Amino acid sequence: GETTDGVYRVMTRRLLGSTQVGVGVMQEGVFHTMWHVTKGAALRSGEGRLDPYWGDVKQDLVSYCGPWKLDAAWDGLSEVQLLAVPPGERAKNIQTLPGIFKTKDGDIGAVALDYPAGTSGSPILDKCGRVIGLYGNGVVIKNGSYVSAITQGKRE
């Protein structure tokens, strides 16, 4: 199927019509998405099959066809862009200054942008276009809006 680098929609035909369950990143022949999008199931790309290669429910990440390739990190200072791919809508870049999730094991960047759940897996980019993490795993604040972590894997 298609193995060109870029952002992709993750669709399903199990429910009514064609439904977008999430988004992913194809880089160096490896497809990267969030675990809650596919639950580790195999994917189709045209007539080709993509098999899971690595995954972890606690990190909420999964890679297909090879190991996790994305290793860029938020510098902790600069604005970033969420390349939002909402269901039935065109890919759109939204620039924001990340906040921070403070945890017992360290700080993580966080993006306060609200999108449908089917947008999970959209990449967050630095000024050089490098993917510093994926959007879609976070928390609901007092306001009712979602604040997502900048979730990044480890390039082994």
Partner 1 sequence: DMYIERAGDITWEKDAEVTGNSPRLDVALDESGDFSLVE
Cα 50 to Cα 6, 66, 88: the distances in Å are 16, 10, 23
| # residues contacting partner 1 (CB under 8 A) | 68
- Count CB-CB contacts under 10 A for residue 10: 20
Tell me how far, at minimum, the Cβ of 114 lies from ligand A1BGX, in Å.
Answer: 7
Residue at 115: amino acid letter: Y
Is 36 among the residues that bind ligand A1BGX (CB under 6 A)? yes
Of 65 and 148, CB closest to ligand A1BGX = 148
Degrees, nearest 5: CA angle 148-151-152? 160
Alpha-carbon Rg for the chain in angstroms: 15
Do 102 and 109 contact (CB within 8 A), yes or no?
A: no
137 binds ligand A1BGX (CB under 6 A): yes
How far apart CA 129 and CA 126 sit, in angstroms, is: 5
Q: Does 155 bind partner 1 (CB under 8 A)?
A: no
Tell me: does residue 103 bind partner 1 (CB under 8 A).
yes
- Is 5 designated active site? no
Give the footprint of partner 1 on this chain (CB under 8 A): 1-2, 4-14, 21, 23-25, 27, 31, 35-36, 38, 41-45, 50, 57-60, 79, 81, 83, 85, 91-105, 110-113, 123, 125-129, 131, 137-139, 141, 147, 149
Give the footprint of ligand A1BGX on this chain (CB under 6 A): 36, 115, 117, 119-120, 136-137, 140, 146
